[PDB]
Amino acid sequence: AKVCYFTGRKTSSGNNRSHAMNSTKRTVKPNLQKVRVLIDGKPKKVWVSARALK
Amino acid sequence: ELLDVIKRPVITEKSMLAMDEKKYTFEVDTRANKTLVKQAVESAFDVKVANVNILNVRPKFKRMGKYAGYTKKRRKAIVTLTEDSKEIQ
């Protein structure tokens, strides 16, 4: 899971508060799936988000 | 380019003693084979093979004026002959 091939989704980072507002650092990552798609007719395998599978 | 092969003859105490057996002490520029020196000598003096010998020299210090510097690298060449002489030097 590194990028999207169609959209521009990539992994990132943000805080994490818990019930007395102590902050740490997360790794917020997108849902990604290895999908066989038809790039210029020739099939590849590539990472596509599930958001573009609607 | 074989006139930049040989530079000078060496005139020392052993080099004059090499003259008695048809052996001559030249300074050849760096990165030169034995074969270039044979071809250059045969071009410039009409003599033959009886193979060359080739040395190298590591440099030295000198000091003049609170300064410290090396000298050049060198490369000798002790060329032997078969049949001719060089009363040229």
């Binding site: - | 006139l3 040989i6 530079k7 000078r8 003859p9 005139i11 030097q89």
Partner: protein
């Protein structure tokens, strides 16, 4: 020096190149053995070869 060098043909340039290199051999061996009251002829042969090579540079563009 320049002008009569610009008067020659093409091959005579190469002939004078060979003659001046042989004079440089002779001035080297006659410097090593303690000779040559003229030592200021060594710049002249070098700069003559230089001027000849620039003249041959210009004529072949």
């Amino acid at each position: 020096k320049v002008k009569e060098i610009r008067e020659l043909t093409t091959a005579e340039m190469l002939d004078k190149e060979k003659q001046l290199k042989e004079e440089l051999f002779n001035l080297r061996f006659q410097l090593a053995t303690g000779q040559l009251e003229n030592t200021a002829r060594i710049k002249e042969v070098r700069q003559s070869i230089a001027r000849i090579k620039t003249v041959l540079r210009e004529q072949a563009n």
